[PDB]
Design a protein around this nucleic acid. Structure first.
Lengths: 96, 93, 108, 80, 96, 78, 108, 93
DNA sequence: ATCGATGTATATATCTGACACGTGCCTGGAGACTAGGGAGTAATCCCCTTGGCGGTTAAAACGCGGGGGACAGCGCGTACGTGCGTTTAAGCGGTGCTAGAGCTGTCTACGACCAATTGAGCGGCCTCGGCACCGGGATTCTG
DNA sequence: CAGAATCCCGGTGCCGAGGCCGCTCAATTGGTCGTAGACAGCTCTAGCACCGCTTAAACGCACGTACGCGCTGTCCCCCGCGTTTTAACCGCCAAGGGGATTACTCCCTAGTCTCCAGGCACGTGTCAGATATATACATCGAT
């Protein structure tokens, strides 16, 4: 059967997801995570429908920006594969 | 209760710049946030400039200096001309 | 008693000079507010509003649409070397990202 | 609880694809989960602090907008 | 004859300058540079004696931190010599 | 052209305080440009505050305020 | 007309409650200022001052000195994980850097 | 003419923590600017808290919340503890 | 195993100007009283948040074949560090000038506070055409 | 160069954006008056300029070794494709906790006047730190 060579599909996915605009994390799992973390600070809290959407938009923007910085750190070492030390270097220079 | 917004003024400007184009509710909400952001930034710097000089009154010179400190070069260059023209016509009326 | 005429009509602006003067008084920025401050601030806010809406409308036209949507505002701001500097720390909901791929990653 | 496992491997890959990453090492997933958890904890602590000062019991979108604003990142479209 | 091996004097200088706190740039050449830059904004300006000292303290504190960041991104590439691309990467990740 | 007053030995001393062991021959000309770009953004603000007050003498407080606006708070000069 | 005594003596503080109350009213932060605000703010400022001075004084003895100088303040701040987080952006004149050399650079 | 600084109160604290140590004028200047900085941060946040709730007055509740937002986890607990102790001693005097 | 040539630090004596304390006095904090509107309490409405069921396909989890990427080892050639002799101009100590920052006095143009009037713009309603979804055809690009 | 992926075109159809009406409370016009700040004149601090001298630091050269770079080999861990399964998403029904508002009234803060002591300039003097000299002992490179 016909088979695409390694990496041909990855570029197509990059183009697809850079051209789109929808959210990428599942809503119910994220909502349960948010309600779990909050329970450490105050009990019996309630959340508005828009607060979870605001938190999800902020988290996805943060992670996309961190991956953009990490890819430059990978290329500097002449590699293609990103590795944990690239994340640690980016975070150290950003001062996080 | 009644909530104020800039939606009608943004729409009047849009009708002046592009008569045939329209705007969605989400874009209007973004524009309504951008206006309040810049308003608070300029009023903040104008207030700091007044206290550093022991003045009790905010004037057009405080706004002009805050504009020159906050906006980049070409934007500040044009905005200062717009404000000067508006104040001159208002006073001449 | 003379017939009222709005301050915005005297200055020729679209934005409300009266509302701006009210907001300047209620925010406690200072104990006195001069008469020239609100006309200048209104003229500056109107200039920046029209400066953004023009680029957004051009982006909407290139996409062959008639209504402006947040994607067009993101494309307008991030393609201008001065708007992007003033609004660098701002994230716009449903704005997405600009297409960009590192040349090292493309095939030979 | 196990709810941190809800951020599956495919979701992390989609996020990395939007950022232009072509090839991903198998150890990146646990690192990304650890990086995300501290961010959520920091924002939620501030949001609950504003909620408690108002004596409310429901957490509203404004508490989130103000928290993000304090951290130094501004969100447009939800209010303010 | 007598001669030290490459790198021992460099380490001894590192240990020297990290212990002291004096300024390292020449005062008079820096002052002439400040006078030359300000002339593009306004003529016949005067400067208080403490303004030049505040500027010099700020500039040296900035350059030391930039070199600290550049050295980490040099080591990451498994090198020891710092090069221009390390400065460029540090400044890009810092957002300046 | 006084940028040449920032000599190579001074740059090396700054690199030593920062912990750099070995330095490439092209670092000097890159550092001069970086410093030249940094100084202009502070002086422009200091002069703006000086002009608003209608003074002719640039003052230490103008520099303190110029730096604080950029996020670089300096303690010691009042 | 009883003999006057300071509010700081009633609260048991060294800092000036009266000066703080004056500075709040003169800043235009709000139109009204309550009675308890200055006592609380004075106590907070006294606490942070005593903590900084204690660490600086300990750093002075470690160098057999008898007078505190900026170097001791820098070493006191940069060696404490809490104070260093609060004062991360502050630059202290004549403070210098901490001694640190990467293990990769030391001799084999 | 007449200046105003905290050097008296800083010296009074120093002689309580370390009665055998002195402080140079250059260090005193840094200690004097430190208090002005933290004072401005806390008063700023307290004003924003009052404005968001639509209140005309600043009270100890605004100061306590600003402290809990600005100071780290360990510094906040002690600062809040002695702030409340001071207020209780004042109100019970 | 160690030698010996360099380097950093310590111990003693002499000096000087930075720090700690006391005095005079003036302007800003404390005591006493009055007026009034901001905040605290209680009660009502109703809206939007939490909880549950049924069910269908979009999305995640698990296997496996193989190839192209990360990593270690080797050779080589030239860029940088260490040390010397020469020469440039920074640092210091002194004197003199005058530009302009800081202050007091006079006074008059500006903005704040009230009252009466009415129209600008916000909330509820209607509706129709911009957009999106389905299906089939045309073009591109890759192994 | 066969064929798998993306784009586009013609048809259907619905609910989001554009426009109208009622109406009430926020902005305008007119008047008084108190003090913020614009202008004129003076004092005297400290920023700018010039000179002579010593010697600290910058500059230019030689040389040799340690580093950066390019090439080769190999092996194992990512990617792409297929099958099974699990829990996300949509739509519909209940109910009651908590947000938002109104009406009352009381107690907290702002303001004016008096008066008196806290803390700000100024002057003095003595000892902590800076420096020169001598020397101890630790480290680095070759034998």
């Amino acid at each position: 059967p016909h088979r695409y060579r390694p990496g041909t599909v990855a570029l197509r996915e990059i183009r697809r997801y850079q051209k789109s605009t929808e959210l990428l994390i599942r809503k119910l799992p994220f909502q349960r995570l948010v309600r779990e973390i909050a329970q450490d600070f105050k009990t019996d809290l309630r959340f508005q429908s828009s607060a979870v959407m605001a938190l999800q938009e902020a988290c996805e923007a943060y992670l996309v920006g961190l991956f953009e910085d990490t890819n430059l750190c990978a290329i500097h070492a002449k590699r293609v594969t990103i590795m944990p030390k690239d994340i640690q270097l980016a975070r150290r220079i950003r001062g996080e | 209760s009644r909530k104020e917004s800039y939606s009608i003024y943004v729409y009047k400007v849009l009708k002046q710049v592009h008569p045939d184009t329209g705007i969605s509710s989400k874009a209007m909400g973004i524009m309504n946030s951008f206006v309040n952001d810049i308003f608070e930034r300029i009023a903040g710097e104008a207030s700091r400039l007044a206290h550093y000089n022991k003045r009790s009154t905010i004037t057009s010179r405080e706004i002009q200096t805050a504009v020159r400190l906050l906006l980049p070069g070409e934007l500040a260059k044009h905005a200062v001309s717009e404000g000067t023209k508006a104040v001159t016509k208002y006073t001449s009326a | 008693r003379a017939k009222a005429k709005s301050r915005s009509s005297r200055a020729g602006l679209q934005f409300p000079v009266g509302r701006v003067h009210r907001l300047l008084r209620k925010g406690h920025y200072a104990e006195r507010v001069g008469a020239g401050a609100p006309v200048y601030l209104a003229a500056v806010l109107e200039y920046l509003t029209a400066e953004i809406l023009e680029l957004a409308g051009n982006a909407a036209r290139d996409n062959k649409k008639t209504r402006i949507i947040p994607r067009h505002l993101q494309l307008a701001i991030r393609n201008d070397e001065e708007l992007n500097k003033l609004l660098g720390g701002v994230t716009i909901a449903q704005g997405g990202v600009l297409p960009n791929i590192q040349a090292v990653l493309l095939p030979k | 609880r196990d709810n941190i496992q809800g951020i599956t491997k495919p979701a992390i890959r989609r996020l990395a694809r939007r950022g232009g990453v072509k090839r991903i090492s198998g150890l990146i997933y646990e690192e990304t989960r650890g990086v995300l958890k501290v961010f959520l904890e920091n924002v939620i602590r501030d949001a609950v602090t504003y909620t408690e000062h108002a004596k409310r019991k429901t957490v509203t979108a404004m508490d989130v907008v103000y928290a993000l604003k304090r951290q130094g990142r501004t969100l447009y479209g939800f209010g303010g």
